[PDB]
Design an enzyme around this catalytic site. Structure first.
Site, PDB file in Angstrom:
ATOM      1  N   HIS A 107      28.495  56.909  10.693  1.00 31.62           N
ATOM      2  CA  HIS A 107      29.296  55.625  12.008  1.00 31.62           C
ATOM      3  C   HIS A 107      28.553  55.667  13.073  1.00 31.62           C
ATOM      4  CE1 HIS A 107      31.961  55.449   8.582  1.00 31.62           C
ATOM      5  NE2 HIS A 107      32.885  55.091   9.630  1.00 31.62           N
TER       6      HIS A 107
ATOM      7  N   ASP B 154      27.219  59.516   5.412  1.00 36.27           N
ATOM      8  CA  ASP B 154      27.777  58.152   5.854  1.00 36.27           C
ATOM      9  C   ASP B 154      27.618  58.126   7.740  1.00 36.27           C
ATOM     10  OD1 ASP B 154      29.593  57.099   7.323  1.00 36.27           O
ATOM     11  OD2 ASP B 154      31.174  56.618   5.985  1.00 36.27           O
TER      12      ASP B 154
ATOM     13  N   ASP C  59      41.817  51.265   4.847  1.00 35.06           N
ATOM     14  CA  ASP C  59      43.147  52.529   4.606  1.00 35.06           C
ATOM     15  C   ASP C  59      43.850  52.379   4.653  1.00 35.06           C
ATOM     16  OD1 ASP C  59      40.934  54.103   6.311  1.00 35.06           O
ATOM     17  OD2 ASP C  59      39.966  52.259   7.561  1.00 35.06           O
TER      18      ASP C  59
ATOM     19  N   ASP D 120      35.125  48.139   3.766  1.00 34.29           N
ATOM     20  CA  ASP D 120      36.380  49.100   4.364  1.00 34.29           C
ATOM     21  C   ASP D 120      37.928  49.644   4.599  1.00 34.29           C
ATOM     22  OD1 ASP D 120      37.122  51.766   5.012  1.00 34.29           O
ATOM     23  OD2 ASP D 120      35.664  52.253   6.742  1.00 34.29           O
TER      24      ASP D 120
END
Ligand code: BOG
Ligand code: BOG
Length: 297
Positions: A212, A210, A85, A83
């Protein structure tokens, strides 16, 4: 050949096979109010997940056949997930934060397919036909723990830490609806046969969920992309052990090209939701290797 008026609901053949599925899917997030630049990207991948595959074919007329197919994973498979960013809008192009998760697994995956074949050529040693059909596939992943390399306030890839073994996790489900057109065929010399199949779609609709998990940052994302492209290429080789029993081996590739769609966010903590047009992107590809038998009753 393809010019013979008759009906044969009698002509049927079954196909059962075993093998593996390998693939990768990229989950992306975009900021509309910021040029629509990419800010997040999750790369879920996995290799050699065992699968059982099968098909039933009805050769009703010399002109057309109906078919139903499907496959599914034979249990879970550990994979990997990354992941990243791009929080620096002044340097979008170089990631600022990367979280690695070796403790990831493909919970399951499956697919069914219903189609019709319009034969252009239909002889004893060779077949060529147009296809039109619909397919649906599903994927489910889970990532746990893992290490990171974040970027502090006034730093860059400095906050290099590690996650609680098994804690903070992420659930990822996907769905692909695919109306499609194709070309299939195979030539036969003696008792040996080589074939191929090609599929295309510009009407794919994918959606994902998704999760979290974290009693701190417990959010839920949902995206949907439309009019997405899909391509597929498959080839096989087999031998007629008996007049009506073909042992064969096959290799298939398929891709769903990335495209933007809308996303919806649900913050359980603050009970706040947020919608963003063209805020999401979805893409994937898979490799399927299989071997099995085609029995023509
Ligand atoms: C012929 C079909 C056999 C299907 C059985 C698949 C068994 C592997 O399946 C896996 O087993 C693990 C251990 O219990 C579980 O933790 C996983 O959730 C499960 O998917
Ligand atoms: C001969 C055919 C054998 C088929 C074996 C099917 C085993 C079911 O597999 C199950 O599929 C579920 C998807 O809903 C997953 O959530 C489970 O973890 C998985 O074990």
């Amino acid at each position: 050949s393809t010019e013979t008026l008759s009906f044969t609901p009698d002509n049927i053949n079954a196909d059962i096979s075993l093998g593996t599925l390998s693939g990768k899917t990229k989950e992306r997030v975009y900021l509309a109010e910021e040029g629509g630049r990419k800010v997040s990207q999750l790369d879920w991948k996995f290799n050699n997940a065992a699968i059982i595959k099968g098909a039933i074919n009805w050769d009703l007329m010399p002109q057309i056949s109906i078919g139903a197919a499907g496959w599914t994973t034979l249990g879970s498979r550990g994979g990997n997930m990354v992941d990243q960013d791009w929080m620096d809008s002044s340097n979008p192009g170089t990631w600022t934060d990367e979280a690695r998760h070796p403790d990831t697994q493909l919970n399951y995956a499956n697919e069914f397919d219903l189609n019709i074949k319009g034969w252009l050529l239909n002889e004893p040693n060779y077949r060529l036909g147009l296809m039109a059909g619909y397919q649906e596939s599903r994927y489910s992943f889970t990532a746990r723990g893992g290490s990171y390399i974040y970027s502090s306030e006034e730093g860059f890839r400095d906050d290099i830490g590690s996650f609680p073994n098994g804690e903070r996790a992420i659930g990822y489900k996907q769905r692909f609806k695919m109306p499609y057109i194709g070309l299939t065929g195979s030539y036969r010399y003696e008792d040996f046969e080589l074939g191929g199949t090609f599929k295309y779609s510009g009407w794919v609709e994918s959606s994902d969920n998704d999760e979290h998990y974290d009693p701190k940052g417990r959010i839920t994302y949902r995206s949907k992309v439309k009019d997405q492209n899909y391509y597929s290429v498959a080839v096989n080789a087999g031998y007629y052990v008996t007049p009506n029993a073909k042992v064969y081996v096959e290799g298939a590739w398929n891709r769903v090209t990335n495209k933007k769609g809308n996303t919806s966010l649900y913050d359980h903590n603050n009970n706040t939701s947020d919608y963003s047009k063209n805020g999401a992107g979805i893409e994937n590809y898979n490799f399927i290797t299989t071997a099995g038998l085609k029995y023509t009753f």
